Design a protein around this ligand. Structure first.
Ligand SMILES: [Cl-]
Ligand SMILES: [Mg+2]
Ligand SMILES: [Mg+2]
Lengths: 241, 111, 244, 235, 240, 250, 231, 195, 243
């Protein structure tokens, strides 16, 4: 039974190492969510600092890949950082070679191709991570593209990742079934973040303090993460209506 | 254009006696019409009762002597502290010099 | 490390056989039968396509018979994809020889080169061998008309008539019975088709299940012509010989 | 399977230990060192009477002052001999002198452990390296595939080794002559050999300061065999 | 590159891959070598399971390495081509650098060295081939006959056989070949070579190949009819 | 580090089977149905856009891909494997042909190059075979229209019409009854939609179906005017609206 | 058990069995003792023979004028490692006109041995080394294990029955450290230490091997009748 | 080296090559054979830079001899000449080209025809009835243009060759120490020992 | 089963058992800690005295990287040294190209990526060390801890080795009782105490205390070893607290 140890086909036509890499994805027990506004793309993720000895400012699964592209990871931090460093290098090389900023979907495809190679070549293992790339693309507008250990990737209206992804997914599905549009009809990104947090609260059934969340926002020509105090202001506005 | 060679002057002299030998050399080091040092040793005790001097371009001379001294050290390690005879040292030095047949040590050597 | 997963494709059995070569030959025994018959005035190549469909585009299809140059052709038995790798190498070797010596490559020299490549995969590299057996049909001015075969072991031999693929035991017996040295091409054509008709696993032998080719000096004066038969031409020769 | 450079739980390299078993199956080779010279002798062991025995070359010249006998997978020895000859002559080129027997032996033994996943396995042959130099005089070395080499006053290797070594234990003393050593090798070879010893299935050689390394003629050895038979019948 | 050590020692001190290569030689067709007073003859078996063969173009069992040296073999056919090619290249390489053709002993030593190298090199398996190398040294009238095997050992033989049922024909040669008086003529040498193969071959038709090599690059292969005359004469004497 | 898997991972078993190729074909069997039909004046290739989530934008995932202006491709099996094959197929069309001869390769030769790449993954060291079967439709001046299937082994066959994946056995039977040598392109599209409806469970419309054709030259899709000999690509992907229009006449 | 096939595999308890098996080869090896004072450092080694006709395998190797070691285990591996030390000592002299510090020599050996314990294909070194030397910070003694662990000590012993000599040195610690400016008495303490590891056999003239280095003493080895003084 | 001539007659090819070898101002040898037998019915003469000539010739010889043994067959003169041309055309763009000009005289046993090929160091091949390299043609071609017929006997070819050498000996400043003449025909290669 | 026999193989859980086995080697090692203070960091380690023959203060365990970073580790000591050698190469190339000394977070990722790389292939073994490291840069003080998996985070206090639980408990008290912060000299005293308290898990053999520190005020942002009077002062403070 060595067909379960390396990335070769089982008799059923399956790659067990890829399937087990998907299971490593949920090892952190963190849930993430991404939605699109008119002018922005928002990504939120649960933040859990179990140890009091940790410096909470260094605990993060959201990465600034380029000025325009942000990336949230679902999976262990070593693989997450491996993917982050590679994506940063690829984004920079692209700009140097082709004279313009690497689009979000193109980076996703590139990282997905790298993931595919690990599923075909034996000496390389898959990374046990799911990568969600976000930006406000200059051609396509607000963009969410997600990559997994199988080498699969696709664009999204909105998306969710983690142990309780299904609950969040259905919650979002039901909202877009009502509104009948592919985005959150809202002007400011502040209110789009408030929407994202509100719908995560409803789906998971848990309340959040300022230190329980982690937020990333993509606007035209820049991606940035919110501080604890920026999130607190967001939580206050939710409670006051 | 860069010239990797130079001339540090000096003169050396070796004479073989019946049961002794001498190797002499002046201690002056020069470039062009200037004196670098009035006392810069040029003849060296290399071990195993062998003395050596590489005259001409000092940098190449120092490198060769340094390499031969090293060759004596490794001759002891590899051959059970055997004494390196003068005839064996001479042959060894020929191969040290010919290693740079196409970028020579610009020196006239006496042991 | 990686050693754990190595099949070791290039080793002897205790009996002194090469495992992978033997298993590759087992693969080839399930492939469509290919027959070669050499006559005094030409060579015949016949081969059976494997369980086809009505929706297969036959006239543009090629799975059995391939052209190496103007003088030499091959019939294939085994993995088609493996065979095409080798065929393209053989085509290049023939052109290299022509560029070097300004003469068409002798048949045996081309055969030896391909057979040497196959041999290499059985002795070094740790890769699986090519699951292919060839029948070479060719002509040169030294030995005239020649038939050769090569298999995954890289061993090659010359023949007057030979079969590869499925039912070679039965096919070789039938050829050995009816073959004669003073035979001609038209007779050899008939023998090849009759042998396939009796050895085939199909219910009946039809034009759409066959590939056919001849190498004749039946070209205007001292020169050689290769004829890869078209579907309609295979249908005609089947009626002529009285099989359909 | 398992690594080629793997240690056993006892702290030994599996492959080196297994190569030693191959050497035990090899034909017998004996060396005896004296103050008048070193004698090397071997069992030829032809597999058939049609095999021309004089083509069996299990005693070999490395330099004028160094000889070598082999036992085990003798085909493996050819590259070792080639390296030894090259090392001996190369040192003569660099230093205008003969190379020390120990230094030559050390150079050969440096090849031994150059195996892994370099060559794919250890050598399956042991060597008796005999010679003379000005510093340490007449010497006999036993070079194994482990990379280890011991100096010996007398040594036997091959299938009849432990029986021969026990005999060499009793017979050797520091005042042996060359003639006495010759007869002693013949005596012990005759004892451990399957077939009856003669000039065609056994070979002698020696290394002296004056004449250097010499392989003995079949006519010369035949006389030493006849001299042996008579002196054993003398008591 | 593929570096895997395929030929390795076993607990009992055997290299199984080298020994299994000898089993491939045992499977191969019988080859025999007999040297007379002024010649050497190489005999080879052709298995008659393969008829409808084209004997003009089929690779002959005996191969010329140079104008004065020949090589026959038993074992894997494809493997033998690689040794023959290397040998032929070395023969021309020796003529080019030393200005003399190879001695038979030198050529044998080279081929045996190649076989040995493939028993302790990574990623390769041993040659499943044993060879008989015969010929005459330049400006020498003494016959030469050598044998090699997968392990890489080689030796000189007055007469030798290799391949399937080689045990039987070696038995025949050991009692029939006299060293004090070897086959004085070509006829006697060929006759003894054919006789030895008739112990094993089956039919004396197209199953026996004979190649005579004489001094000064005089090499010829006998035809079917010439060999058939030896086969006829042998059995007619046997009916008594 | 270093790739130490320099040995084959696909090997012959005692029965003569190449396991990894067979297992790759099994992966293709599990894959979504795709098909191809050849007409007199064109070729059509089609498949189902099996969306993994309704939140996912299935327009961004392209199962039918342009390889050259006159050649297109569709697959069944593992999507990621297909994606990288398309990337390599597009590149090899330039490096091994267009940069040499100054024109795009004919269908059969591009197929041959793709087949070679897939064969090498079946024999080279430290790799598994591609888990896809490709259907490649194309046109060129001297061969006309053509349709090819390419399997994980590297073997390729020309077809008049065929299907691969989930419901291929049923679909091939359906095509045998409907296909003839006098079909016009619109008739082939109609048959493609009928055949594909049988294998689809859920929604069946322009947004859940991906369909492209190799047909007439499209000068409107060229992007420039002024060169008479350049008349535009023959490959065209049908829009969501164009599919739905033909579903009313179904 | 299942985790001892190669050096690249941890066991479930976090052990490296191939390294532990290499460590076992040292225990089979002949005993050797190391000890130092503030002025000198001494190596004492019990040499082993194959039989009565054979020579006694050399245990001590010189690396530089101011540094050398003694070995226990696979002798060829000691030759490889000592050769490396010779080169490193030599690189320090030729480039920096600087005698290599004994502590830095230990760090280099540690790092060389470590690479063999983390990579596939290779194997750990099957030898233990005792390095003595005199540098700018005085006399030094190091113990090298092929796991990579190098330890600076006042005194130690490795090989078969080495525990007896190690206990003796642990008692004598306060005495032999004070033996300054007296090479003969320091050697006596080393010979008396190695004697605690002997059974059946005793120290003979071609059995014993001693080495010393110090303030105005280059690394020199004593064998044969040169050690009869200490028997 | 200096002068190499070639002439193809009815049933043979005749190659004439100078005997002189010069180092500095001194003639070291006056009996040098500037030729190599490539196969029993193929002969190659050569001229060019010192050392390169023999090296190249012997390298070609080894390759053709290797081919002969492998196939048990003699390559045609045309095939050999094409192999030689390729080796020179390969050589001219090398780091250090081989500065060798050759004439290849052979008898094709299949076609029963003599054949003469002239190839220079660039890899410029031409089949000719008569040929030369260097300055040799400047003196000799006018005689050959006048006297040459294709139906000439071997004896007539030798007489016309003598006239060419006499003209060279009269009008060339260099003393080339006469020529060694060799004939290539159906029976093989032989040397004319008196010329 | 068989998933734990090879590195870089995912078990059906999604775990790399070979990395988890490397952690067992870390847990087997001696105790080492790190404390983040007001303007710097303090490192301390337990050195087991196996024998009287060990020369005191000679077998130094804590290692410096560049001139501003300190590294300490528990587990397989050679593996730790290998990691520091790489760290020194990374820090050198950073300074070569960018001029400024390597920032601590930047340095932490360099080690992290390198350790993580040894979980990607079966041809290499994971590191048998957890490494505590840190120092002072332009943005102030930073303390990090790096596991065999390549996982690392920033810390207020950090501990690893056989006595990590005991140490962690003591570190948690300091964080609670000093929200405003701890001074550099206080951190040295506390570091000594914690190692002494953590020595109850290795109580068979006696030990030697080793401390180092980087502080903006006390060491000018350079890594230095605590020596002489300041070391003895910390030992006395530690001994007073256990009694
Ligand atoms: Cl890519
Ligand atoms: Mg993999
Ligand atoms: Mg010309």
């Amino acid at each position: 039974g060595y067909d379960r140890h390396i990335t070769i086909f089982s008799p059923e036509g399956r790659l067990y190492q890829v399937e087990y890499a998907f299971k490593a994805t949920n090892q952190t027990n963190i849930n993430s969510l991404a939605v699109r506004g008119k002018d922005c793309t928002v990504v939120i993720s649960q933040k859990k600092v179990p140890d009091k000895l940790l410096d909470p400012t260094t605990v993060s699964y959201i990465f600034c890949i380029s000025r325009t592209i942000g990336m949230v990871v679902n999976g262990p931090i070593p693989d997450a950082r491996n993917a982050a460093l590679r994506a940063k290098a690829e984004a920079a090389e692209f700009r140097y070679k082709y004279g313009y900023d690497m689009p979000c979907d193109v980076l996703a495809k590139r990282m997905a191709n790298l993931s595919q190679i690990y599923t075909q070549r034996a000496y390389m293992r898959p990374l046990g991570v799911i990568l969600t790339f976000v930006s406000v693309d200059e051609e396509l507008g607000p963009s969410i593209y997600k990559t997994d250990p199988a080498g699969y990737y696709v664009g999204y209206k909105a998306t969710a990742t983690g142990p309780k992804q299904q609950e969040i997914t259905t919650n979002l599905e039901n909202h877009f079934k009502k509104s009948k549009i592919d985005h959150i009809n809202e002007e400011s990104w502040e209110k789009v973040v408030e929407f994202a947090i509100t719908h995560m609260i409803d789906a998971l059934g848990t309340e959040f303090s300022k230190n329980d969340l982690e937020v990333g926002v993509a606007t035209k020509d820049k991606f940035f993460t919110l501080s604890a105090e920026n999130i607190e202001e967001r939580l206050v506005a939710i409670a006051e209506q | 254009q860069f010239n990797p060679y130079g001339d540090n002057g000096g003169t050396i002299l070796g004479i073989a006696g019946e049961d002794f030998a001498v190797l002499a050399g002046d201690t002056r080091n020069i470039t062009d019409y200037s004196i670098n040092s009035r006392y810069e040793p040029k003849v060296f005790d290399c071990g195993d009762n062998i003395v050596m001097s590489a005259n001409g371009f000092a940098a190449d001379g120092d490198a060769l002597v340094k390499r031969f001294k090293n060759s004596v050290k490794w001759y002891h390690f590899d051959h059970n502290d055997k004494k390196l005879s003068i005839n064996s040292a001479a042959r060894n030095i020929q191969h040290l010099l010919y290693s740079r047949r196409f970028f020579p040590y610009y020196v006239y050597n006496i042991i | 490390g990686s050693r754990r997963y190595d099949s070791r494709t290039t080793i002897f059995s205790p009996e002194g056989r090469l495992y992978q070569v033997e298993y590759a030959l087992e693969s080839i025994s399930h492939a469509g039968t290919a027959i070669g018959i050499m006559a005094s005035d030409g060579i015949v190549l016949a081969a059976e396509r494997k369980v086809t469909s009505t929706l297969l585009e036959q006239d543009t299809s090629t799975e059995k018979l391939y052209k190496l140059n103007d003088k030499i052709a091959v019939a294939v038995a085994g993995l088609t994809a493996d065979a095409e790798i080798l065929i393209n190498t053989a085509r290049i070797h023939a052109q290299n020889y022509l560029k070097t010596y300004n003469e068409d490559i002798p048949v045996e020299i081309l055969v030896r080169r391909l057979s040497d490549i196959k041999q290499g995969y059985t002795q070094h590299g740790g890769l699986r061998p090519f699951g292919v057996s060839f029948i070479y049909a060719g002509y040169d001015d030294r030995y005239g008309y020649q038939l050769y075969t090569s298999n995954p072991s890289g061993n090659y031999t010359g023949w007057k008539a030979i079969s590869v693929g499925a039912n070679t035991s039965a096919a070789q017996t039938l050829l050995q019975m009816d073959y004669k040295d003073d035979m001609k091409v038209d007779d050899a054509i008939e023998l090849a088709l009759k042998t396939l008709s009796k050895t085939t696993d199909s219910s009946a032998l039809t034009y759409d299940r066959l590939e056919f080719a001849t190498i004749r000096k039946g070209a205007n004066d001292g020169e050689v012509y290769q004829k890869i038969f078209k579907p309609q031409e295979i249908k005609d020769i089947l009626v002529k010989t009285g099989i359909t | 399977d398992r690594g080629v450079s793997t240690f056993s739980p006892e702290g030994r390299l599996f492959q080196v230990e297994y190569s030693l078993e191959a050497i035990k199956l090899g034909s017998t080779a004996i060396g005896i060192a004296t103050k008048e010279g070193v004698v090397l002798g071997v069992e030829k062991r032809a597999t058939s009477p049609l095999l021309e025995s004089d083509s069996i070359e299990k005693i070999v010249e490395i330099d004028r002052h160094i000889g070598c006998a082999m036992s085990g997978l003798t085909a493996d020895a050819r590259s070792m001999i080639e390296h030894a000859r090259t090392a001996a002559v190369t040192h003569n080129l660099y230093y205008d002198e003969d190379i020390n027997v120990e230094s030559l032996t050390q150079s050969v033994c440096d090849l031994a452990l150059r195996f892994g996943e370099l060559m794919s396995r250890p050598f399956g042959v042991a060597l008796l390296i005999a010679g003379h130099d000005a510093d340490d005089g007449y010497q006999l070395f036993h070079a194994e595939p482990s990379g280890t080499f011991y100096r010996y006053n007398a040594k036997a290797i091959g299938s009849g080794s432990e029986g021969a070594q026990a005999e060499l234990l009793n017979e050797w003393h520091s005042s042996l002559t060359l003639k006495e050593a010759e007869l002693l090798v013949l005596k012990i070879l005759k004892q451990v050999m399957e077939e009856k010893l003669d000039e065609n299935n056994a070979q002698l050689s020696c290394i002296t300061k004056q004449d250097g390394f010499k392989i003995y003629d079949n006519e010369k050895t035949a006389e030493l065999i006849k001299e042996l038979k008579e002196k054993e019948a003398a008591e | 590159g593929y570096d895997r050590a395929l030929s390795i020692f076993s607990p009992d001190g055997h290299i199984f891959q080298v020994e299994y290569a000898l089993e491939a030689v045992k499977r191969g067709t019988c080859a025999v070598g007999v040297k007379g007073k002024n010649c050497v003859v190489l005999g080879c078996e052709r298995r008659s399971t393969l008829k409808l063969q084209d004997t003009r173009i089929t690779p002959s069992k005996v191969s010329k390495i140079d104008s004065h040296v020949v090589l026959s073999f038993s074992g894997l056919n494809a493997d033998s081509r690689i040794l023959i090619e290397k040998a032929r290249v070395e023969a021309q390489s020796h003529r080019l650098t030393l200005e003399d053709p190879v001695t038979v002993e030198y050529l044998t030593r080279y081929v045996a060295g190649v076989q040995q190298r493939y028993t302790q090199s990574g990623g390769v398996r041993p040659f499943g081939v044993s060879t008989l190398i015969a010929g005459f040294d330049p400006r020498d009238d003494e016959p030469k006959l050598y044998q090699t095997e997968p392990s890489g050992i080689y030796s000189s033989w007055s007469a030798q056989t290799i391949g399937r049922n080689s045990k039987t024909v070696r038995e025949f040669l050991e009692k029939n070949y006299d060293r004090k008086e070897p086959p004085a003529t070509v006829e006697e040498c060929v006759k003894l070579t054919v006789r030895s193969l008739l112990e094993v071959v089956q039919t004396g038709a197209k199953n026996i190949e004979i190649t005579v090599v004489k001094p000064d690059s005089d090499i010829v292969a006998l035809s079917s009819e010439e060999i058939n005359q030896y086969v006829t004469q042998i059995e007619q004497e046997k009916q008594e | 580090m270093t790739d130490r898997y320099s040995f084959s991972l696909t090997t012959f078993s005692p029965s003569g089977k190449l396991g990894q190729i067979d297992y790759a074909l099994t992966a293709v069997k599990q894959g979504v149905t795709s098909l191809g039909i050849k007409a007199t004046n064109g070729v059509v290739i089609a498949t189902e856009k099996k969306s993994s989530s309704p939140l996912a934008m299935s327009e961004t995932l392209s199962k039918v891909s342009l390889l050259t202006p006159d050649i297109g491709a569709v697959y069944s099996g593992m999507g990621p494997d297909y994606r990288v094959l398309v990337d390599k197929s597009r590149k090899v069309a330039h490096t091994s042909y267009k940069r040499i001869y100054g024109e795009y390769p004919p269908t059969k030769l591009l197929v041959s190059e793709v087949a070679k790449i897939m064969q090498e993954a079946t024999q080279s060291g430290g790799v598994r075979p591609f888990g896809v079967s490709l259907l490649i439709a194309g046109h060129d001046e001297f061969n006309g229209f053509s349709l090819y299937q390419v399997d994980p082994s590297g073997s390729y066959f020309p077809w008049k019409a065929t299907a691969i994946g989930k419901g291929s056995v049923a679909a091939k039977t359906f095509l045998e009854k409907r296909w003839n040598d006098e079909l016009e392109l619109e008739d082939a599209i109609h048959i493609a939609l009928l055949t594909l409806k049988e294998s689809v469970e859920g929604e069946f419309n322009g947004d859940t179906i991906e369909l492209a054709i190799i047909g007439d030259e499209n000068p409107d899709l060229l992007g420039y005017t002024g060169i008479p000999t350049d008349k535009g690509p023959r490959f065209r992907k049908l829009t969501s609206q164009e599919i739905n229009d033909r579903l009313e006449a179904l | 058990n299942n985790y001892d096939g190669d050096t690249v595999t941890f066991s479930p308890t976090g052990r490296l069995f191939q390294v532990e098996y290499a460590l076992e080869a040292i225990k089979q090896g002949s005993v050797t003792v190391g000890l130092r004072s503030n002025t000198h450092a001494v190596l004492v080694a019990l040499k082993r023979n194959a039989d009565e006709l054979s020579s006694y395998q050399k245990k001590i190797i010189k690396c530089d004028e101011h540094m050398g070691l003694s070995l226990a285990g696979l002798a060829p591996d000691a030759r490889v490692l000592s050769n490396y030390l010779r080169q490193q000592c030599n690189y320090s002299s030729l480039v920096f006109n600087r005698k290599l510090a004994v502590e830095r020599a230990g760090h280099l050996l540690c790092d060389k041995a470590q690479k063999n314990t983390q990579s596939y294909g290779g194997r750990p070194y099957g030898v233990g080394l005792l390095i003595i030397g005199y540098d700018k910070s005085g006399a030094h003694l190091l113990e090298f294990q092929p796991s990579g662990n190098v330890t600076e000590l006042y005194g130690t012993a490795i090989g078969a029955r080495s525990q007896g000599a190690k206990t003796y040195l642990e008692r004598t610690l306060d005495t032999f450290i004070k033996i300054d400016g007296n090479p003969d008495e320091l050697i006596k303490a080393g010979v008396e230490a190695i004697s605690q590891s002997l059974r059946d056999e005793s120290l003979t003239v071609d059995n014993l091997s001693i080495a010393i280095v110090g303030k105005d003493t280059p690394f020199t080895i004593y064998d044969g009748e040169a050690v009869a003084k200490y028997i | 080296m200096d002068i190499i001539l070639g002439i193809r007659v009815q049933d043979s090819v005749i190659l004439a090559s100078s005997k002189a070898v010069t180092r500095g101002i001194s003639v070291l040898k006056d009996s040098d054979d500037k030729t190599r037998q490539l196969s029993p019915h193929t002969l190659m003469s050569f001229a060019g830079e010192a050392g390169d000539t023999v090296q190249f010739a012997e390298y070609i010889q080894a390759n053709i001899q290797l081919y002969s043994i492998r196939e048990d067959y003699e390559l045609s003169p045309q095939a050999v000449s094409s192999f030689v041309r390729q080796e020179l055309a390969k050589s001219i763009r090398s780091r250090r080209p081989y500065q060798v000009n050759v004439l290849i005289g052979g008898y094709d046993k299949k076609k029963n025809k003599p054949e003469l090929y002239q190839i220079d160091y660039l890899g410029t091949k031409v089949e000719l009835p008569y040929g030369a390299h260097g300055y040799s043609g400047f003196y000799t071609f006018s005689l050959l243009d006048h006297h040459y017929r294709p139906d000439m006997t071997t004896e007539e070819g030798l007489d016309l060759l003598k006239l060419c050498v006499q003209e060279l000996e009269k009008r060339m400043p260099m003393d080339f120490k006469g020529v060694i003449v060799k004939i290539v025909d159906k029976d093989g290669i032989r040397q004319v020992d008196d010329f | 089963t068989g998933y734990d026999l090879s590195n870089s193989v995912f078990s059906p859980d999604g775990r790399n058992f070979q990395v988890e086995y490397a952690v067992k080697a870390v847990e087997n090692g001696t105790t080492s800690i790190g404390i983040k203070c007001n303007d710097g960091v303090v490192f301390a380690v337990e050195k087991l005295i196996t024998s009287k023959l060990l020369v005191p203060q000679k077998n130094v365990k804590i290692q410096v990287v560049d001139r501003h970073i300190g590294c300490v580790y528990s587990g397989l000591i050679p593996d730790g040294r290998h990691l520091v050698n790489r760290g020194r190469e990374e820090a050198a190339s950073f300074k070569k190209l960018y001029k400024t000394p390597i920032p601590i977070p930047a340095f932490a990722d360099r080690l992290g990526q390198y350790v993580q790389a040894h979980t990607l292939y079966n041809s290499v073994r994971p590191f048998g060390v957890s490494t505590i490291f840190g120092g002072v840069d332009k943005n102030g003080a930073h303390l990090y801890m790096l596991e065999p998996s390549g996982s690392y985070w920033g810390y207020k206090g950090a501990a690893t080795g056989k006595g990590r639980q005991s140490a962690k408990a003591e570190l948690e008290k300091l964080v609670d009782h000093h929200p405003e912060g701890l001074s550099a000299r206080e951190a040295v005293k506390q570091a000594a105490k914690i190692i002494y308290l953590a020595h109850e898990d290795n109580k068979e053999k006696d030990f030697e205390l080793e401390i180092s520190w980087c502080s903006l005020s006390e060491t000018n942002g350079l890594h230095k070893f605590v020596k002489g009077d300041l070391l003895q002062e910390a030992i006395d403070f530690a001994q007073k607290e256990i009694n």
